[PDB]
């Protein structure tokens, strides 16, 4: 129609003006007098071996001790990080797994990938083994991320440019979030578990409301596909990593771009983004086999986590902020402190 | 210094390690092929002769092959193609009868150029299956090949086609020093395609075995 030519575009213009009406100062100017974090040195405290293929996913437990990892060898291993013991080893029906989640209660785990099916596995069974509790189907594209709301609800993002909130007991899609024009690569859940941000391949990250299921907000600025996303611990901001070798801290309340983390020596994309407990340090896994820790308030590279022999595919920080786990394509999980 | 429960947990972890090692040893002995095509280009026929990923397992000469079909993935290929980085070979199916349809041969050529020159398949060999021999013969006796390639200059006989079809497909491989393209002409009823795939996989495994020794 004629209106789509300008009306929507006109609205876009207004939005920019609104953002231009609030960018009186920048984050660097505000946090210019803050003392720098300084050099950050983390050593590889633990190395987890047992995966025989590229590790594509990892998720810490809420007890900050157990962690689940997924590899292309068809294995979902639940690790005791303190003693490097293998608590569980689940063989997956499909070895093309690209994501995994660990339930906050610790009773269930989730996996999914190129099979377009989110498999929920029950860990606390009277039989003493791990069995497929549920197999949620309905996504028409590869399932790239999944996060547990509780023992009964789970949000997933797939390559069909849609997200879905599933009720596990019924196995149906309680809600469907649409609006992305590209593959959704990652999603993050807010601490209050009422909103969630999903970054897609259209170089945009959308804030959705879980309750009613509508796109509350849209954030742009990236020049390539967004591969990772993570909320600030406060819950009023988030960080996105993309393929243009740039991380970006966006603001929910200001609905703008707060800060950009990039270096000229970095030309490789970001595969994973995570925050520390206080939010001062932003950890990002890169394709150059490294993992950079930035001063989230100063856009200064505080440190480099360089041990891995292949692309750092997944990254996580414990809820108590005591350790950072990195999983790379060299089939090794490394805990840093 | 461990307690009884901790020692038993360590024993369970060691048993899990043993099972994982056995499973990995079993998986490493299996051949993984990635089946690609331009849609309805003979992939179904090739699968017959031997939602998401479709895995087909078949045993030939005491060798287990797993073909992964990605036809159901309508999303962006570059976001998940790196999963198939360790496949022994890529079976690319091209229908010879699609040269005068809509252009479609040009689409197959573009797909082959994208797959062969991908940054992940820098050393993964490609087995090229040119399907529909008989229908191609019928359509080339009547319709000249100049419809697909305006620059063609040759007779319109079935003796054509490897030269100026397979040659054009192989010229898209501008990394010839690192990989080889195995081209085979096949039809509906051949029963020799499995043997050709086995021979190509033997060559690939010999090359990889040598690279492992450093000989290469």
């Amino acid at each position, epitope marked *: 129609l004629d209106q789509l030519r300008q009306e929507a575009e006109q609205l876009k213009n207004q939005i920019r003006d609104a953002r231009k009406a609030c960018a009186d100062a920048t984050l660097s100017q505000i946090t210019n007098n803050i003392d720098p974090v300084g050099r950050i040195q983390m050593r590889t405290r633990r190395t987890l071996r047992g995966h025989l293929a590229k590790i594509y996913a990892m998720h810490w437990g809420t007890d900050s001790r157990l962690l689940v990892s997924a590899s292309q060898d068809g294995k979902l291993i639940i690790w005791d990080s303190y003693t490097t*013991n293998k*608590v569980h080893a689940i063989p997956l029906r499909s070895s093309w797994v690209m994501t995994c989640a660990y339930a906050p209660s610790g009773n269930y785990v989730a996996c999914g990938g190129l099979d377009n099916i989110c498999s929920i596995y029950n860990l606390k069974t009277r*039989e*003493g*083994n791990v069995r497929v509790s549920r197999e949620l189907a309905g996504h028409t594209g590869y399932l790239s991320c999944c996060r547990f709301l509780d023992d009964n609800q789970i949000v997933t993002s797939s390559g069909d440019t849609t997200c879905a909130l599933w009720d596990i007991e019924t196995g149906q899609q309680t809600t469907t979030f649409t609006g992305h024009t590209g593959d959704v690569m990652s999603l993050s859940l807010a601490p209050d578990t009422r909103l969630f941000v999903s970054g897609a391949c259209d170089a945009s990250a959308k804030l959705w409301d879980v309750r009613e299921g509508m796109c509350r907000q849209t954030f742009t600025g990236h020049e390539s596909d967004i591969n990772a996303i993570c909320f600030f611990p406060n819950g009023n901001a988030f960080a996105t990593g993309s393929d243009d070798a740039t991380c970006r801290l966006f603001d929910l309340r200001a609905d703008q771009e707060l800060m950009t983390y990039s270096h000229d020596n970095i030309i490789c994309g970001i595969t994973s983004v995570s925050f520390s407990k206080s939010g001062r340090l932003l950890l990002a896994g890169y394709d150059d086999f490294n993992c950079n820790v930035w001063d989230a308030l100063k856009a200064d590279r505080a440190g480099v986590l360089a041990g891995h022999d292949n692309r750092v595919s997944c990254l996580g920080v414990t809820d108590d902020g005591m350790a950072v786990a990195t999983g790379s394509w060299d089939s090794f999980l490394k805990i840093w402190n | 210094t461990l*307690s009884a429960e901790d020692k038993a*947990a360590v*024993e*369970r972890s060691k*048993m899990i390690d043993r099972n994982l090692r056995e499973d990995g040893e079993k998986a490493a002995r299996e051949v993984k092929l990635l089946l690609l095509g331009a849609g309805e280009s003979g992939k179904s026929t090739i699968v017959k002769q031997m939602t998401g990923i479709v895995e087909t397992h078949f045993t030939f000469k005491d060798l287990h092959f797993k073909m992964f079909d990605v036809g159901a993935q309508r999303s962006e290929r570059k976001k998940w193609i790196h999963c198939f980085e360790g496949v022994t070979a890529i079976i690319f199916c091209v229908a010879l009868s699609d040269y005068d349809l809509v252009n479609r041969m040009h689409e197959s050529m573009k797909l082959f150029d994208s797959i062969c020159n991908n940054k992940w398949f820098t050393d993964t060999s490609i087995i090229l299956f040119l399907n529909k021999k008989d229908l191609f013969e019928e359509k080339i006796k009547k319709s000249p090949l100049t419809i697909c390639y305006p620059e063609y200059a040759g007779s319109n006989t079935y003796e054509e086609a490897a030269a100026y079809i397979q040659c054009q497909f192989e010229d898209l491989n501008k990394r010839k020093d690192t990989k080889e393209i195995y081209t085979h002409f096949t039809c509906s009823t051949d029963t020799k395609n499995v043997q050709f795939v086995f021979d190509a996989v033997t060559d690939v495994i010999i090359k990889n075995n040598l690279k492992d020794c450093g000989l290469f």
Partner: single-chain antibody
Amino acid sequence: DVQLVESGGGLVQPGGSRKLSCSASGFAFSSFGMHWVRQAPEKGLEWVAYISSGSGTIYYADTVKGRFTISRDDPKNTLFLQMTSLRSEDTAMYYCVRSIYYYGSSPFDFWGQGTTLTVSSSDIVMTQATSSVPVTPGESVSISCRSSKSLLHSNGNTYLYWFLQRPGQSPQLLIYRMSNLASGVPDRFSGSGSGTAFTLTISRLEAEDVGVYYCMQHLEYPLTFGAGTKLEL
């Protein structure tokens, strides 16, 4: 359902030999360590033997080492106890217990029904002092236990278990590692305490709670049970 049905009991002449079998159904027998635990007629429980998962670790009590032997047939899901040179002290009801060991696991979840074997004519000490406590239903009861050696390991876990044996029934797990409540146990039970001094508190003592309470240690391996405190009325 999960069950351990066992047989092999009866009357045995002294100096003989008998084979006790325990068929397990309803759970992954291969992934569970298995314990043989005997209870003499009227003097509480006593741990006897243990086979690990995969049969990689075998343990026996001091009073049955060498004399007894324990094995498992995983394909047939069976646990065997070959017990020879039997004496008058071996008459007891034997129980087949499952226990899986990993982080956060609950050992000694399920106990078998027990088979009576009647013969025709270091070592942490667990003490419970009081053996009989008569309390009317509806009140709160505290049951005490003590150990010769502190059960608080360097890991932070305190390996003590609280079991209940109801009249004419097999022992049931209530508390594992002194703080955790076993699955299916009502919340009215609560275990607490520190090394060398442990307690189990029942807030609203209802019916079907009368029985004998045992405190067991798991820090050293010759596992030892308490004398047993019995609840009346």
